Design an enzyme around this catalytic site. Structure first.
Site, mmCIF file in Angstrom:
data_model
loop_
_atom_site.group_PDB
_atom_site.id
_atom_site.type_symbol
_atom_site.label_atom_id
_atom_site.label_comp_id
_atom_site.label_asym_id
_atom_site.label_seq_id
_atom_site.Cartn_x
_atom_site.Cartn_y
_atom_site.Cartn_z
ATOM 1 N N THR A 1 -6.209 -0.928 10.457
ATOM 2 C CA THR A 1 -5.721 0.184 11.271
ATOM 3 C C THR A 1 -5.588 -0.153 12.755
ATOM 4 O O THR A 1 -6.559 -0.511 13.412
ATOM 5 C CB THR A 1 -6.520 1.474 11.092
ATOM 6 O OG1 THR A 1 -6.390 1.941 9.731
ATOM 7 C CG2 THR A 1 -5.988 2.556 12.060
ATOM 8 N N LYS B 1 -12.786 3.299 0.812
ATOM 9 C CA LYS B 1 -12.519 3.337 2.231
ATOM 10 C C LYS B 1 -13.703 3.952 2.957
ATOM 11 O O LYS B 1 -14.101 5.065 2.636
ATOM 12 C CB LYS B 1 -11.263 4.153 2.486
ATOM 13 C CG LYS B 1 -10.012 3.511 1.926
ATOM 14 C CD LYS B 1 -8.812 4.451 2.018
ATOM 15 C CE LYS B 1 -8.453 4.777 3.465
ATOM 16 N NZ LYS B 1 -7.156 5.504 3.543
ATOM 17 N N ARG C 1 -5.507 19.000 7.726
ATOM 18 C CA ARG C 1 -4.353 18.981 8.639
ATOM 19 C C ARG C 1 -4.082 20.348 9.248
ATOM 20 O O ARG C 1 -4.568 21.369 8.759
ATOM 21 C CB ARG C 1 -3.098 18.491 7.919
ATOM 22 C CG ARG C 1 -3.248 17.128 7.288
ATOM 23 C CD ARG C 1 -2.099 16.219 7.672
ATOM 24 N NE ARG C 1 -1.919 15.167 6.686
ATOM 25 C CZ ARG C 1 -0.985 15.187 5.742
ATOM 26 N NH1 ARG C 1 -0.088 16.172 5.708
ATOM 27 N NH2 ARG C 1 -0.917 14.200 4.857
ATOM 28 N N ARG D 1 0.842 -1.188 0.000
ATOM 29 C CA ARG D 1 0.000 0.000 0.000
ATOM 30 C C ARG D 1 0.872 1.231 0.000
ATOM 31 O O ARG D 1 1.678 1.427 0.903
ATOM 32 C CB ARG D 1 -0.896 0.011 1.234
ATOM 33 C CG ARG D 1 -1.573 1.335 1.494
ATOM 34 C CD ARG D 1 -2.458 1.220 2.714
ATOM 35 N NE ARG D 1 -3.085 2.487 3.048
ATOM 36 C CZ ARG D 1 -2.727 3.273 4.063
ATOM 37 N NH1 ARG D 1 -1.772 2.899 4.904
ATOM 38 N NH2 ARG D 1 -3.366 4.429 4.243
#
Ligand SMILES: O=P(O)(O)OC[C@H]1O[C@@](CO)(OP(=O)(O)O)[C@@H](O)[C@@H]1O
Ligand SMILES: O=P(O)(O)OC[C@H]1O[C@@](CO)(OP(=O)(O)O)[C@@H](O)[C@@H]1O
Ligand SMILES: O=C([O-])C(=O)[O-]
Ligand SMILES: O=C([O-])C(=O)[O-]
Ligand SMILES: [K+]
Ligand SMILES: [K+]
Ligand SMILES: [Mg+2]
Ligand SMILES: [Mg+2]
Lengths: 498, 498, 498, 498
Positions: A296, A238, A90, A49
């Site tokens: 995760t 996702k 962010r 990935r």
């Protein structure tokens, strides 16, 4: 019953010899060299990935090259997954690179670029320009995987919010921002994402992990972005927020597969609800026979320690019992101290969980939910798995060019390997996200057309011998077309290995 | 099917109001004050655990006293559990207090107590006289909670094994030794444990968490040491090694309860095999209707962090889905920064797993494994739970003095609260390890003997209204004896709340 | 599975000691004396059926008196059923009393009363005045249980049809006429029926078998005819034609129970469809807990022979396996040579079939189909049967005044007797059409009010002893109200016989 | 559930087009002519049965010849079955040819052959030398097909039993004797049966119906008597007494098939116990996949009447629901007035029961009792039926030379026709006792050897179109070998009709 199954379990029996489940590893500084990739592969990496949240095209180009080189050296088909930044939010930088906060600490947050590099305890930058539309006075901003929350006290101007800090936190540079239950409308495919996707098609990546998919429409946007040269690349959506979970049925229908992205998900919805969403999402994917990846913090402590916690071990085992095709590693292999060992643990746990699984419960549950009449190939593939069970086949063998027939056999969750002889290297690499499938390439240009399937079958059985799936005298369940039918398999044979 | 149940889950519906599962918290410097314990209780602690691995009687006396003061302030019945040091094998001492080993090092390990105090790289002592019978060449010795591992190369004499160091480690004086897969023979009750057990009896503790139970004989030895004055205290056997797992049936039969003690267990058996042991043990307990507690590292990171990892959230939910009555916290509440938040998360996760549980599947699975004919009390109790599902009862009510009948009802895993009206404070405290049960104390010395049940029943129904389990005109399922039968309930009524 | 059950069956095991199923006998010249009735009762008659197709009120009055006298002499509660003529169609008489027909034989049939007594090979009388409206040219008249058919060639006048005879037949006096799929509209309750019903109420009959019910409306007409003094009499609707089967759900909802009247049914619809209607009707009745009676030609050959055919034996056994509460005899006991023996056969077959029945299959199937939440009494009664199974109770005991609670326990098909203590003799007699129920009368005027149920319970347990259902030490499942609740049972006890 | 399936039945829907079950008819003076047999066949006879209890070889030669002429005229494959006289015990003769007994009469019965020809009321002969060992005091002797029954009072010497006559009867010379529940020891093949069996072999009959099989040794004796030249003829063992029922497992294992011969069986064991035997035998046959025939009095009254009784209609339907491949007619076609009508009814009843059968319940129940691992041919066959349900196939097609594979498919009870293409006329004829199968003959001597299956497959698919089982573009499930495997089918294809 599950209960009666459980009481019969033994820690003393031998485990499965062939691992059904598949492992996705995120590449980073720990793991980018050809050598480190060879070792990841040896430890049990099936898919690599690339996280396009970070790094340039050059950096990932080095990942792509190094993967292909490792895999060729080892004789493996390893999938390459491009994971999009998507609509990430962010913080900017801070003077020194950390600042520190206390509860009741009043902080101004701004979208003014001018404060990007130079943030402090009283004023700092967030790279979402519509911030002061997205979240009103009373609402809440989650910072750094939702560890610190900020209550918004007021809108100062269109660029600036005054915020009430709700707890203690140690703030590093460029941290993640989450805005649960706000009117955030950023594109699924930004300008940045569009270039990254185009690069993926040019570089021949096998699949996209598309971040923050919240609608079937957004899946289609990712499809359109990949353009004409990109139509055979898998889109794994996702699921990562409220809307993703809400729209799951139709997101599944649009996608090739699904990742439960538990990281963002468990900030975006209350953390304790992630277990419920996981069970629900994995099962829905099982029912339509589409790959699903659990992701995760699965072995998170192993980013620093040589052994996982008890919670982490059960988390991996239960993702497998839940029905996940794949389990994923992120930080653990990208930047951890024990990349190889963590992948090895994950593999051993997978095999335990697989050996703890009741043989036929999945087969039946899935079959009972399918609309009758089936199309012929699905009738062939489900009955093929049924007869594998009835003869205790040690392997199945299916000819698949697109991968469709191999994913269809896998949908019915046999307890043995599914050897897939394909005519496309990309199918070899893509079937890595499908439980049980082990791929062999038939080069039809080099070896001829194989109309009667005898060359491909022989190659599958020889592979069965060499990889020690079955030996002379063992029954194998072989699925392809008869001599006339084109486009799907209409035939099942039972074959003794010669 | 589990699969069908999954696809129909919704993350958005309201969750259960009444938490069924129970939470054991370990006390320590984080949590010992009367203040800290009040908050723990408000947060969801049902049982306070004292780890007698560490600390004097003085220390634990403070814990005992403080718990009782905290509970009396809040009007709660809180179980107190003594968790024993238990047997252990340890190394001797080392010259200069420490020694450093490296892969490939060859070390002799001896049971010659001449070497007890002069450990070197070449040679050191282990205080288990039977060592050279219990582990054969090719077997492992784990040192320091599994951190260092030795392979046994050969037996040099009847007190000495030549070994091969497998990894880098620094040893200090008197480290732990584990002998994975080895038939170890130590007293169930050491000299130290006697004193600890004598103390517990005198201070009136509700339950022993007995460490490292290998056999039923060991449970009986622990019962013997508790004596006449301690005959009413629950023994919960900690399953911490392969022997415990091997002998689970007879151990369960001898015990009042089981703890899957995953810390030591994950050292004694491969870590991936802990999930199989856990599933099997919890189910086997469910089948005979004895409480089982899942333990250790369930929410490890919250020792340091204010939110749990994704793995951890799933570990707790799955322990509930496995069928555990209780989940437990050690480090997380004994010594962690966020004792309250961690209990609150554990409560919320429990409730989510509960809400995601198919109502009746456990009831049917459990009932279908019972031997026919049942005892009448168990027919009455299982049929009571049946009838509670049939009328969607919001609560059940049972009269139990020993707590037997409350455990018998819980065994069948109704989906509502089980109100227990009891004549023993100690029963209230002990019923804290039993799923779904909520105790109310009826003072017979103060209100009369209630031969006809009418006062205890009213007390329970009043309690149902106060605690908001059910209101006027709701059906409650009420279980006790008729007017003549003594020693067990032979009667179920359905009653509308007045 | 049924299959796995079957392979385990043994012809060598002992049979059930207490017959669950109930037998209805039609009284006639063979069986009307007090003595013959005593013997029918001894052989196993539970209900006596008066067929009001024939005989005057005096004749049936003799039946009623003789039944009551036999039953009193023997100490039994025997139900008395009045079976209505209803909308029957018959032929008149013929010269001599037989005539004979050949295929192609052209016969005139008339509704002219003047030809009633004096019919021939060319002209005869049918007592349906609307004949020539009901059936047009091309249609078909079925004569004598549909043995000979007549094709209608033309309507001669409003009184007369010319008919084509389709086969050979021997025509006796006053034979039955059937008109499948014709616009026949005669009343469910004729003038003749109205008097017969009024007589039933006056004579205190326990139930009506209402012939040819085709609508819920018609059930209500029978209810209205029975008037105010007649409201507690059961109406069992006889399903007998196309429309009856079509309207079955709503006919069931209006009725107290159902008879599958296979005689007229298998002329009115093709004979081979009767098996399908039977399975369907019996099951629908089981599901709502209403008695159902299978009827007609069950042991037909035994009208003349001392043994039944193989087909007849399986027919009775399968009516029982189908789930029928009762099986019925008609000609066999009314005018046969072996009344006693046929009733005895039927009983022995019943008990075989009952012993071949899987214990709990009916319980579960029925329970799974009930809407949740149940009312409290149904939750009590189903859970009572469940706990009978769990303790292998040899009997149940229920207090029922109307019979409702006894029919509700029976609905769940326990494998033991249901002893019902009732305060009404009519309930004793009516519960005879309910599988498993054995009735005891408590005279509340003579013995007092029994608020606490102790007199009625004691009487039920003493009956259990005397009839050899259970002995000292055996568990019995006892169902009634607690000390407060009026109108339904809210309580279940398990009781050891003292 | 059966119960749910029932409530959802409709009497009004169209029934199945293709009759699955098969019908055996006994030939006699009613049915022997070529004409009569043509009509029998048109009416639905698949197998013609010759009762060798009666008649010379000359007679049955006419039957054989006429059947073959009738079938050749119609283009049908009709099985011919020889049903043996079998063993029997009979009385001696009586003075004046007859004697009359009354309840209470005391009679000695002797195996002293001195008395063979001088039977009186006081004393008569039975030709079974072992009598006084086989029936003990208190046991019964049945005389004249059960019509008269004696209780054995005592043993007078080693050849004489004193007996008590139970009922009125007239005996004549040489009546039948049955010894219910008694271990009788007679040759399986008598001198007469040898000749009959030799005849059958010479005339090329397809199957023996072997009377009164007590043990597997007896089946083997019948196989031995058939010799080398008869090794291909089916042995169908008639189960006619308790021994047959006791030894059913090993008898089934030795036989090709079973007939539940209810006539004698209802004499040998209590009549009510015949239903239990029937259910158990049919199911046990289904489980191993061997044909079973239910026999005797299924439609008795239609010997005399043109319509069947209600009991009879239900007997036939239930035999089908039990799971019988075949039902049978004796008297009804051998000597009755309505041979065609009776077969036509039996056909129509079969179809109604078929149409009322839950598709898949038999398939699952049967599959779940098979030992794993299966032989590959049986995996292929059961999975083929699976896949036929999944695509709602209108027909299946199998190539079978011995008929093994056709029986193996039928074993799993698909809901559609099973077309069998075979290279043996005798296989066509023999497959007549197997549910669902319809045979087509491929002439290899005349069309070539068809190594690649293509001609036989086309023949079958053509046959599917002609007989109207399926048409263009319907999926048919096709089972045979691939191009290299010999001796069994290892391949299933799904094929659209061109
Ligand atoms: O203490 P346990 O073993 O649960 O027994 C309690 C049961 O026994 C009975 C009868 O003896 O107690 P009680 O006498 O206190 O009323 C039942 O009422 C009660 O449900
Ligand atoms: O006669 P049975 O035992 O049914 O065997 C038939 C099977 O064997 C095979 C293979 O041998 O026969 P065939 O050689 O005639 O083609 C399969 O094609 C066929 O399905
Ligand atoms: O993006 C991810 O993979 C996540 O959030 O878990
Ligand atoms: O009326 C009846 O009872 C019948 O027709 O069966
Ligand atoms: K401890
Ligand atoms: K015969
Ligand atoms: Mg421990
Ligand atoms: Mg016979």
């Amino acid at each position: 019953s599950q209960l009666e199954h459980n009481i019969g379990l033994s820690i003393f029996e031998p485990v499965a010899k062939h691992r059904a489940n598949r492992i996705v590893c995120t590449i980073g500084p720990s793991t980018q060299s050809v050598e480190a990739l060879k070792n990841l592969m040896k430890s049990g990496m099936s898919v690599a990935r690339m996280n396009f949240s970070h790094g340039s095209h050059e950096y990932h180009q080095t990942t792509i090259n190094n993967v292909r080189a490792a895999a060729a050296e080892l004789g493996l088909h390893i999938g390459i997954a491009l994971d999009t930044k998507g609509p990430e939010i962010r913080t900017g930088l801070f003077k020194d690179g950390e600042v520190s906060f206390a509860p009741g600490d009043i902080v101004c947050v701004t979208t003014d670029p001018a404060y990007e590099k130079v943030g402090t305890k009283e004023k700092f930058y967030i790279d979402y320009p519509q911030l002061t539309n997205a979240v009103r006075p009373g609402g809440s901003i989650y910072v750094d995987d939702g560890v610190m929350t900020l209550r918004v006290v007021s809108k100062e101007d269109d660029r600036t919010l005054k915020c009430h800090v709700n707890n203690h936190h140690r703030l590093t540079d460029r941290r993640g921002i989450n805005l649960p239950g706000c009117e955030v409308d950023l594109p699924a495919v930004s300008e940045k994402d569009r270039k990254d996707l185009e690069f993926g098609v040019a570089q021949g990546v096998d699949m996209i992990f598309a971040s923050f998919i919240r609608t079937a429409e957004q899946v289609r946007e990712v499809r359109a972005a990949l353009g004409e040269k990109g139509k055979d690349i898998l889109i794994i959506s996702k699921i990562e927020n409220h809307q993703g979970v809400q729209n799951i049925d139709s997101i599944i229908e649009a996608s090739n597969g699904i990742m439960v992205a538990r990281g963002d998900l468990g900030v975006e919805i209350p953390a304790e609800k992630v277990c419920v969403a996981q069970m629900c999402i994995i099962s829905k994917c099982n029912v339509v026979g589409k790959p699903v990846i659990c992701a995760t913090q699965m072995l998170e402590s192993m980013t620093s320690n040589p052994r996982p916690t008890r919670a982490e071990v059960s988390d991996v085992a239960n993702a497998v019992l839940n029905g996940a095709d794949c389990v994923m590693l992120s930080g653990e292999t990208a930047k951890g101290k024990y990349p190889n060992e963590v992948v090895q643990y994950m593999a051993r746990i997978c095999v335990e969980a697989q050996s703890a699984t009741h043989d036929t419960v999945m087969f039946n549950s899935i079959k009972n939910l399918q609309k009758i009449p089936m199309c012929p190939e699905e009738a062939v593939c489900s009955s093929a798995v049924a007869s594998a069970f009835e003869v205790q086949a040690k392997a199945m063998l299916v000819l698949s060019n697109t991968g469709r027939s191999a994913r269809l056999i896998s949908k019915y969750r046999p307890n043995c390997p599914i050897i897939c002889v394909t005519t496309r290297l990309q199918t070899c690499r893509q079937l890595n996200v499908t439980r049980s499938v082990v791929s062999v390439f038939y080069d039809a240009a080099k070896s001829g057309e194989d109309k009667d399937k005898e060359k491909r079958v022989k190659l599958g059985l020889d592979f069965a011998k060499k990889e020690k799936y079955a030996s002379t005298g063992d029954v194998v369940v072989v699925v392809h077309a008869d001599h006339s039918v084109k486009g799907y398999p209409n035939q099942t044979r039972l074959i003794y290995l010669p």
